[PDB]
Design a protein around this ligand. Sequence first.
Ligand SMILES: Nc1ncnc2c1ncn2[C@@H]1O[C@H](COP(=O)(O)OP(=O)(O)OP(=O)(O)O)[C@@H](O)[C@H]1O
Ligand SMILES: Nc1ncnc2c1ncn2[C@@H]1O[C@H](COP(=O)(O)OP(=O)(O)OP(=O)(O)O)[C@@H](O)[C@H]1O
Length: 483
Amino acid sequence: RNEFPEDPEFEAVVRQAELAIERCIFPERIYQGSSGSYFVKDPQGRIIAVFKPKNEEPYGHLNPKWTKWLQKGTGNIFEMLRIDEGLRLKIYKDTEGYYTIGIGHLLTKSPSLNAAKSELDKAIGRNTNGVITKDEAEKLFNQDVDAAVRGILRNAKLKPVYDSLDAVRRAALINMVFQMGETGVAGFTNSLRMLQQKRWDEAAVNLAKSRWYNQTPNRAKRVITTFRTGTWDAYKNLGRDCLVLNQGYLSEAGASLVDQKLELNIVPRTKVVYLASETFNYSAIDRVKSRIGLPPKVGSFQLFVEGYKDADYWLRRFEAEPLPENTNRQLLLQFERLVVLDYIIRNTDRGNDNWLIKYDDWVVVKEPVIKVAAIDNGLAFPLKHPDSWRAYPFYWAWLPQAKVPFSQEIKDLILPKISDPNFVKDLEEDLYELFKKDPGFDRGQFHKQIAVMRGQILNLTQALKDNKSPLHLVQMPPVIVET
Ligand SMILES: Nc1ncnc2c1ncn2[C@@H]1O[C@H](COP(=O)(O)OP(=O)(O)OP(=O)(O)O)[C@@H](O)[C@H]1O
Ligand SMILES: Nc1ncnc2c1ncn2[C@@H]1O[C@H](COP(=O)(O)OP(=O)(O)OP(=O)(O)O)[C@@H](O)[C@H]1O
């Protein structure tokens, strides 16, 4: 059900896409894309669009890169604990103050370092002098995992639960018996009951309250969600966490909404579109029921533009051979629109590969020589400002173009809109109607998104009134406007 009566040009392109699929001309996967980025083509083989299925997103469930991972099932217990325990080749103290080594291997609860060092030689088979190798730490690791699996299966309170768990939760319980040992996890009998009855939101709470967790919450909270969600999501991207989890396609489409309303027209038109293609990455199940073929996947569909190179490609050239004044002033105006987009949607990823330039008495405006396309917008609309601005900056702030004060032209375009509270209200309702359609939508998460966006507008409004540069704009302390 793909229709956009508001945008018959967009719909027409989409219809060529579907028809081209019917004719067995499949969107082909961009190499040097996310595994989940595709080139949509029409029946004549030309590239009309870029398509990014939600479920093939980097955090995506059907993402090819992480498919290898989901097979292991419990066998992910190794990587899971490597991440939680880290690696050390020399004796250290654990969270409780106990002598430890390699990957989470507890030597003794004794205060004596030679108890521990002694205890270490017993294990390794030589005089270690408190220092072991990578292979030695790995050998302790397997034995300690076996000991956990044994601890679970030799135990009456634990075993029943474990057998009722899916491959992933089992891994979580092993995780626990690795840190606390057999006997310790069996004092949780409540949560084991819930886990046992399959109520996830039940148990995820009680483990939230324990002597454990309290000591190492950062780790504890990582399993609890592995218990609650039956997935590896806490061990995938720990953490981006500036952003909502698997809504990249909506960022993509949303970026295009904003462009539309502010009338910037740098974002090639992008909407939420459903497509089915044999070239996509589907569950084996789905592949089989098709024999009634593959189901359509929901994704961002962004129109394709020709004649453009990397911002990087061109700016490199304009520096060696500077543009004539008049053309170069057309660049700056395309550039201001980009800064406004990115500041408003709070893009966390814009590099010089993430935007594109094209360089070529009357009723009509002479065509512009230079023009800016803003692509790859699925990393915006954060839940909050990034903790270290250096990790997720605005790259264009260090460009010289960022030094030039905002043009009257932009103030004229943008101030009347973002100064009108009814514009910002309408803009937020439109984003809501887009975002609420996601099955994993959360009203509370949304409000935070809007808060950031409202704080960015607050800053941009005053930056524009003062004729500040883009650079001075980003130096303004980030704010949120919270209801
Ligand atoms: N709308 C578009 N029109 C024309 N070309 C595009 C468009 N979008 C992307 N491209 C080209 O395809 C490449 C796709 O890059 P894009 O970053 O959008 O996908 P991605 O690589 O999956 O994202 P990421 O780089 O974050 O993994 C771009 O570098 C650009 O060269
Ligand atoms: N590339 C950028 N992207 C985003 N924000 C930036 C960028 N460059 C500067 N800023 C913002 O401008 C402000 C300028 O601070 P700057 O780093 O120049 O001095 P500073 O006081 O050392 O910053 P801090 O001590 O907070 O790291 C920072 O608070 C930051 O918010």
